[PDB]
């Protein structure tokens, strides 16, 4: 999937989001480096958290 800078994923109006970003899974469109910086765990570990917890973590981070 296409990747975009963290600031773009956090600070873009819904209508303006790049077509290649799943708005419900913005974390999948972060580079591996940005994912590591933002979440501090592997992508698999994050995916193993309950969906509601993934969402809650993302809300504070501007990625919900």
For residues 31 and 3, is the Cβ–Cβ distance under 8 A?
A: yes
Structure determined by: X-ray
**Euclidean distance between CA atoms 40 and 33, whole angstroms:** 10
For residues 21 and 29, is the Cβ–Cβ distance under 8 A?
A: yes
H-run or E-run covering 33: helix 32-39
How much of the chain is in helix, strand and coil states, percent to nearest 5? 55, 0, 45
CB atoms within 10 A of CB 11: 10
CB atoms within 10 A of CB 31: 12
Contacts of 30 (CB under 8 A, 6+ apart): 3, 4, 6, 9, 38
CA-only gyration radius of the chain, Å: 11
Top CATH class, 1-64: mainly alpha
**Euclidean distance between CA atoms 1 and 43, whole angstroms:** 14
**Euclidean distance between CA atoms 61 and 22, whole angstroms:** 17
């Amino acid at each position: 999937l296409e990747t975009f800078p963290l600031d773009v994923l956090v600070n873009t109006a819904a209508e303006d989001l790049p077509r290649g970003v799943d708005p419900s899974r913005k974390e999948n469109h972060l580079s591996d480096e940005d994912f590591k910086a933002v979440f501090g765990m592997t992508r698999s570990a994050f995916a193993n958290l309950p969906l509601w917890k993934q969402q809650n973590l993302k809300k504070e981070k501007g990625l919900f």
